[PDB]
Structure formats: structure tokens, C-alpha cells
Amino acid sequence: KMKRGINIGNALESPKDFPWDVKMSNKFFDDIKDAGFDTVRIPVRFSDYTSDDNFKIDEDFFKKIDKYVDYALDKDLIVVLDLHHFEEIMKEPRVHKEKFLKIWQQIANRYQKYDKKLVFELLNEPKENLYSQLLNEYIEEAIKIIRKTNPKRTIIVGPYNFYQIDYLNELNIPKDSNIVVSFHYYEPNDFAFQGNIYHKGFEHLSNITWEGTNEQMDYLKKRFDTVENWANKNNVKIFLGEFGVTKEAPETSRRAWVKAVREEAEKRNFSWAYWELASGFGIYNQIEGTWDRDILSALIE
Ligand SMILES: OC[C@H]1O[C@@H](O)[C@H](O)[C@@H](O)[C@@H]1O
Numbered sequence: 001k002m003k004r005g006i007n008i009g010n011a012l013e014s015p016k017d018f019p020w021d022v023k024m025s026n027k028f029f030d031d032i033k034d035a036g037f038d039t040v041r042i043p044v045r046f047s048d049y050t051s052d053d054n055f056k057i058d059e060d061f062f063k064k065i066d067k068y069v070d071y072a073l074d075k076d077l078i079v080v081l082d083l084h085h086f087e088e089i090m091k092e093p094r095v096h097k098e099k100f101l102k103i104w105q106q107i108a109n110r111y112q113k114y115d116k117k118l119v120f121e122l123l124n125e126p127k128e129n130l131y132s133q134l135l136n137e138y139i140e141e142a143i144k145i146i147r148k149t150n151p152k153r154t155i156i157v158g159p160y161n162f163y164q165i166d167y168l169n170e171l172n173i174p175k176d177s178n179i180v181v182s183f184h185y186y187e188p189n190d191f192a193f194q195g196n197i198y199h200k201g202f203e204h205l206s207n208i209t210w211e212g213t214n215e216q217m218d219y220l221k222k223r224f225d226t227v228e229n230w231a232n233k234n235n236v237k238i239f240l241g242e243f244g245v246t247k248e249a250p251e252t253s254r255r256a257w258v259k260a261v262r263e264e265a266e267k268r269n270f271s272w273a274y275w276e277l278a279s280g281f282g283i284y285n286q287i288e289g290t291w292d293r294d295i296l297s298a299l300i301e
Contacts, residue, residue, distance in 0.1 A: 001117075002078050002180075003266070004300055005039030005273030006032055007242060009281070010198075012065075013084035016048035022279050022286060029072045031289055032277070036300040040077050041241060041273045042068065043084030043124065046103050055102040062110070073115055080156065080241070080273070081107070082121040090128040097138055104142045112149035120146065121156040121241070125163050125184065132160045132170035143174050156239060158182040163241065165223055168230045180271075181234075182241040183227055185261060187219070192257070195248030196280050210253040212260060220264055228268045240265045244275030247282065251294070259298035274299055 008028055010020040032040055044065060049058040065081075072079045083103065089096040104122065111118055122142055126135045139157050146155065155178060159167035163184040171181070186192040194205035210216060231238045243261050245254045258274070265272040278286040283295040 002039045002119075002239060002271035004037045005041055005078070005080070005271065006037050006299075007041040007043065007273055007276050008278075009043060009276040010279040011043070013043035013045045013082075015045065016061075020279070022277070022282075024068060025286070026068065026071045027289065028277065028286075029068070029075050029077060031284065031291075033075045033077055035291060035296065038078055039080065039271065039273060040072055041080040041082055041121075042072075043082045045085045046083055046107075047086040047088065047099070050099065050103065052099075055099045057103065057106050062106075069111070069114075069118065073117055076117070078117045078119060080119045080121050081111075082124055082156075082241075084124040086123060089123075090126070090130050093130040093134050093138070100138060101142055101145060105145055108146040108149050116153070119154040119156060119180075120150070121182070124158075126158070126160050127162050130160070132167065135160055136170075136172040140172070140174055143176060143179075147176070152178050154178050154180060156180045156182050156241070158184075158241070165226055168227065173234050173236055179236065180239045181231065181236045182239040184242040184275075185223070185240060186243060186275075187223065191249065191253070192245050194246060196246040198280060199246075206248075207250060208253075209250055210257045212256050217260065220260060224264050224268055224270075227270075238268075238270045240270050240272035242273065242275040244281040246280055248280075255294055255298050258295055262299050 008024060011022045011024045014020040029040065046057055049061045050056065069079055089100055122139060143155060157179060158181065159171040161167050163182055165183055190205055191208045191210045193199040193202035194208050197203050227238055245257055262272060275281050277284045283292040
């Protein structure tokens with residue numbers, strides 16, 4: 001099902017009391033669908049909308065999610081609903097385990113009848129103190145809750161340290177046929193993030209190139225070898241849930257990197273979703289509804 005996807009980023013994963021620079025809008029799903037994408041990824045920071053008791057998700061905000069998911073779903077888009085930027089659980093996972101499992105109880109109860117095309121992504125980029133042996137324990141506990149109301153819906157999990165290839169070996173594949181494994185890919189980091197203010201440590205880089213040299217192509221291929229090999233041995237399909245390049249980077253390298261990564265993904269039967277529609281990594285002007293053909297051409301011929 002999933003192949004060509006895009007993230008609506010820096011939108012609903014914004015902090016509850018500080019919105020970021022992209023305003024979610026139904027027109028987005030029209031233009032994404034018409035561009036050739038079959039899949040949209042929607043990061044949502046539900047953790048900012050809980051009664052911090054039974055951890056009841058604010059119904060107001062929750063209705064906002066009904067609006068866009070239904071609209072997206074009523075265009076035949078696959079919608080990955082993604083619990084994004086749950087920051088407190090990365091610092092003290094043991095304190096927020098229950099808050100995490102309560103959150104997925106509500107989500108699964110509420111969209112249990114929804115079309116197959118609605119997919120669940122449990123926890124974006126586990127990092128810091130939520131290390132693998134806890135992450136796996138919480139992942140198994142969340143799937144068994146979800147599986148009472150959503151027994152066949154697709155569920156996406158990912159490894160520790162920002163969904164990193166290097167931590168796939170520690171990620172446990174659950175007892176379950178309907179699970180996709182996701183990694184993120186932005187290597188090399190200094191080229192992909194250069195000049196972006198939101199990427200702490202990268203904001204003052206400048207004019208770094210990716211020309212597609214043989215060593216550069218070789219590295220990319222070996223990194224993707226590592227993931228394919230893992231996925232073969234574990235009989236799971238892989239989803240490249242985020243990849244992209246900031247706008248500040250050199251126009252021509254940006255296109256070549258994105259093409260090369262997209263191509264390598266498809267070459268190995270990976271679904272993918274480009275990091276980010278309309279923000280600092282974007283390829284789409286939210287004010288005029290126009291695309292950056294130069295980058296869009298790299299993603300979809
Ligand atoms: O999704 C994680 C992060 O990635 C960056 O692209 C966004 O600009 C940041 O504000 C966000 O914290």
C-alpha cells in the first residue's frame with residue numbers, strides 16, 4: 001500500500017501553547033493527493049493535551065484530529081497518525097509509562113472502526129533514557145492494548161536513538177503480522193541540517209555540498225544494506241518515515257541527495273515519507289499552494 005508519502009511537519013506536533021510555522025489545512029490533503037502521494041504522515045503531540053488523573057485527551061483538540069484524519073481518509077490517502085515529541089517520557093520513562101499507555105487506549109478505542117488506511121505509529125524517535133529494554137517492554141504493552149479493538153490495523157514501531165539504523169538490532173519484533181518497522185535517515189547530518197535554526201548544533205553551518213561521489217553513494221548503499229539485511233532476517237517491511245534536507249542547503253546537492261535516498265528506498269522495497277511539506281525542509285508553499293518542481297521531481301517522476 002504505502003510507497004510515496006510526505007510529512008505535514010511543524011504543525012500539530014507543536015507545543016500546546018506555542019504553534020509553529022505551518023498551519024494544518026484540508027487543502028494540504030488535496031494538493032498532496034494530486035501530487036502523486038499515496039501516504040501522508042501527521043505528527044501529533046497528544047502528550048501536551050492530557051489532564052496530567054486518567055490522562056484524558058482534550059476533546060476539543062481530539063475533534064481537531066477527527067476533522068483532518070477524516071478529510072485525508074476521504075481522499076483515499078493512507079494516514080500515519082504519529083505520537084510525536086513526547087518529551088517527558090524520554091527523560092524519565094518510568095514516570096510516564098502509564099500516561100503513554102493511557103494515550104494509546106483512547107486513540108485505539110476512538111478510531112477502531114476506521115478504514116484500514118488509518119495506521120498507528122506508537123512513539124516517534126525514542127531517545128535519551130527510554131533505552132531499548134524499556135522501549136520494547138512499553139511497545140509490547142501498547143500493542144496488546146490496541147489489539148483488543150484494532151486487531152489487524154497496521155502498527156509502526158522503530159528503534160532507539162531517534163529511529164537509528166544502528167539500534168535496529170536491539171529492537172524486538174513483536175508477535176504480530178501487522179507491524180511495519182520505521183527508520184529515519186538524514187546522513188550525513190551536517191549536510192542535511194545545515195543552516196536550520198530548529199536543529200541545535202547545526203544552525204551556523206553553511207555551503208556544505210553532496211555531489212554524489214562514489215564514496216558518498218557507497219556509504220548510502222551500505223547503510224541501506226544494513227537495514228535491508230535486518231528486515232530480511234526478521235520478515236518485516238520497512239518504512240523510511242522521515243528523510244529530507246533543509247532549504248538553506250545548496251540547491252543542486254539538495255535535489256541529488258533527495259533523489260538518491262528516495263531511489264535507494266524504492267530500490268529495496270522501502271515505503272518512504274519525505275520530511276516535510278511546507279516548513280524549513282519544505283517543497284510546497286502553503287500560502288500559494290505551489291510545489292518546488294525541482295525537489296518534487298526527485299521524489300516522484
Ligand atoms: O521533528 C523534530 C524537529 O525537526 C525539525 O525539522 C523541526 O524544525 C524542529 O522544530 C523539530 O523539533
